[PDB]
Amino acid sequence: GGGGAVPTAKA
Amino acid sequence: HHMLVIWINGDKGYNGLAQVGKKFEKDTGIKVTVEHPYKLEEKFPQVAATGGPDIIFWAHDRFGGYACSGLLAEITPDKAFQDKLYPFTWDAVRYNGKLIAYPIAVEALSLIYNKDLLPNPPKTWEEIPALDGELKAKGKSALMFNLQEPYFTWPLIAADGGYAFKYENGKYDIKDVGVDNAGAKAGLTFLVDLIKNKHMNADTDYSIAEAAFNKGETAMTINGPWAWSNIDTSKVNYGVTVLPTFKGQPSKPFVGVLSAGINAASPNKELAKEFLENYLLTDEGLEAVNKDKPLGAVALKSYEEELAKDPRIAATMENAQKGEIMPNIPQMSAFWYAVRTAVINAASGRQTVDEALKDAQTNAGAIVTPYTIKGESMDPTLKDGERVAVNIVGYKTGLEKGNVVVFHANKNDDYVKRVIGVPGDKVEYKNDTLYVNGKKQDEPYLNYNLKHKQGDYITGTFQVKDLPNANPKSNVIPKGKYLVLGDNREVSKDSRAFGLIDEDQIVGKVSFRFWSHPQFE
Ligand SMILES: OC[C@H]1O[C@H](O[C@H]2[C@H](O)[C@@H](O)[C@@H](O)O[C@@H]2CO)[C@H](O)[C@@H](O)[C@@H]1O
């Protein structure tokens, strides 16, 4: 694909 | 800000392209620098943001991945300009409805042969063993070509039915991968048989095959138009012809469109456009590149009308017609890596064809998406800010104890924790000792935290039956449910607090690089 930000995962 | 930096592959006419750059500089004062870094197609995503080239040249297949990663600017050619290029070439550089590169030329592999050694090239792959026997008797070989890159072996693999991703009803289906079907197996088997019988060497690479053909040591090679210049220089009396058939079926090369993309982070997007539209993609610009190393069948109609007169370009396009345009989807990178591994392992004898292609089938369609880790609750296994690759888990497919999983905790938040029990597992802790299905299980990933603890125990005693979404009568984890804990057990809010999670929440598995591996295998 889309071109967006890299998602985040909370540890 | 002052100049344009351009990346193009080392097998292409980069000196010719530099001449076009000199013309642009002479007219505009803006300097153009052409570079050909090793594996530039892999380096580009690394550097793209952290200003990389302003313009990158590669076959169109890599660009959808780049666009999906936000690395490319949408290009803005007007109607007049688009009309100067063949419509099918614009198709190759359109991704999610937008044009993401300028097409330059169509590339297809052909059979290249030495007319003095072999006046009649073979119609069939099946003839090559006997042919090689005859040529070995005079200290030559029949066929040498790059076995290290699957691009070159693909035509034979796809001949009797192999494919990458099925295109149907306007879309590629990335669940439908054709790497381990009967046709693919037969083609790869034939290649392996050639190697077993010493008609080819598994170590043959681009340079080895090119040197051999150009020195008159092998009767045939398989290569694209960019190779013809060096053969001209060598004085070998060569022909360029249709690839042989396999089991009666034409070889089917994957067809590339050499394309030029503009870096989304370039401050010179307007100059890039001017260079590509008004200097490169003209009769004069393409001629300068083409005279260095031939481009193939160019996208620019006016110049292609001249190049199409060349029998070698007719051969190129004849092979293209039996092949297929490469997909440009992000998943292409994974496909190529998967097939490269399969061909190497099958050819070296590390795996049987069936094993190699079984793994490739799996790896080619496995979706990998980047994530960034936030917080300390997996420390030191994963650190705050750490970049990771996440292997997407198919809808209702193979989660196992020890997998580190990303999952949807709610509509807004994804979490990452380790799978400690799967459905059917009976699980409890006594202090810091993990019991799974009645047996103590070591947890080496907790070693550092176990040995640097504040309290008496980092996990502490608990039983699955006491947690939310568990069966309160049993420590056996219910169907569809998972017990997940954070490696930083002293601070982690995990299943000990919020209970068992559901299969439907799981996004994927974090891939890890192990620090040790063999020095050669
Ligand atoms: O071998 C996999 C490789 O195939 C294609 O790369 C070609 C390229 O298209 C040609 O222009 C020429 O440079 O030879 C390359 C093969 O070494 C795909 O374009 C590429 O993405 C893929 O990794």
Contact B377 A10 (CB under 8 A): yes
Distance (Å, whole) CA B322 – CA B326:
13
Q: Are B279 and B23 in contact (CB under 8 A)?
A: yes
Same fold, B4-107+256-325 and B110-252+331-365: yes
Distance (Å, whole) CA B307 – CA B323:
21
Number of residues assigned to chain B: 521
Q: Are B158 and B183 in contact (CB under 8 A)?
A: yes
Distance (Å, whole) CA B266 – CA B259:
17
Distance (Å, whole) CA B459 – CA B91:
56
Domain locations in chain B?
A: 4-107+256-325, 110-252+331-365, 368-510
A 1-11 → B contacts, CB under 8 A: 2-4, 6-11
Strand B254-262 to B55-59 pairing? antiparallel
Quick check: is B417 catalytic?
yes
- CB atoms inside a 10 Å sphere around CB B245: 18
Q: Nearest residue on chain B to A8, judged by CA atoms? A: B372
Q: Among B104, B151, B157, B325, name the best residue to mutate to test ligand 1's pocket (greatest count of ligand atoms within 8 A of Cβ).
A: B151
Q: Does ligand 1 come within 6 angstroms of the Cβ of B256?
A: yes
Q: Does ligand 1 come within 6 angstroms of the Cβ of B150?
A: yes
**Residue B163 identity (one-letter amino acid):** Y
Distance (Å, whole) CA B225 – CA B213:
15
Q: What angle do CA B152, B46, B379 make, to 5 degrees?
A: 120
What burial letters (b/e) apply to B11-25, b meaning 16+ CB within 10 Å? ebbbebbbbbbebbe
Cα torsion for B98, B100, B102, B106, to the nearest 10°?
Answer: -90
Cα torsion for B395, B392, B325, B12, to the nearest 10°?
Answer: 180
Please report how many Cα atoms fall inside a 13 Å half-sphere around the Cα of residue B155, on the Cβ side.
27
Helices B283-292 and B14-28: angle between axes, nearest 10 degrees: 140
Measuring CA to CA, which residue among B151, B74, B104, B449 is closest to residue B323?
A: B151
**Residue B379 identity (one-letter amino acid):** D
So what CATH class is B368-510? mainly beta
Distance (Å, whole) CA B451 – CA B262:
51
Please report how many Cα atoms fall inside a 13 Å half-sphere around the Cα of residue B287, on the Cβ side.
7
- The owner of tokens 């000196």 is B15
Give the start-end residues of each E strand in B422-521. 427-430, 433-436, 439-441, 462-463, 481-485, 501-502, 506-510
Distance (Å, whole) CA B184 – CA B166:
14
Token pair, residue B310, equals 């060349």
Distance (Å, whole) CA B34 – CA B110:
28
Measuring CA to CA, which residue among B96, B91, B89, B107 is closest to residue B66?
A: B96
Q: Are B303 and B86 in contact (CB under 8 A)?
A: no
* CATH, range B110-252+331-365: 3.40.190.10
Experimental method: X-ray
Distance (Å, whole) CA B122 – CA B111:
10
Q: Are B404 and B445 in contact (CB under 8 A)?
A: no
Angstrom distances, CA of residue B250 to CA of B101, B156, B441: 31, 9, 56
Q: Is the dihedral of CA B247, B241, B191, B346 positive or negative?
A: negative
Contact B372 A9 (CB under 8 A): yes
Q: Respond yes or no on whether the N-terminal peptide bond of residue B380 is cis (omega within 30° of 0).
A: yes
- The owner of tokens 């392996």 is B192
Q: Which fold is adopted by the domain B4-107+256-325?
A: D-Maltodextrin-Binding Protein; domain 2 (3.40.190)
Q: Are B470 and B450 in contact (CB under 8 A)?
A: no
Token pair, residue B279, equals 């200097």
Contact A11 B382 (CB under 8 A): yes
Of the candidates B377, B492, B495, B509, the residue annotated as catalytic is B377
Backbone angles phi, psi at B371, to 5 degrees: -135, 160
Measuring CA to CA, which residue among B498, B478, B438, B487 is closest to residue B459?
A: B487
Q: Are B405 and B508 in contact (CB under 8 A)?
A: yes
- CB atoms inside a 10 Å sphere around CB B248: 9
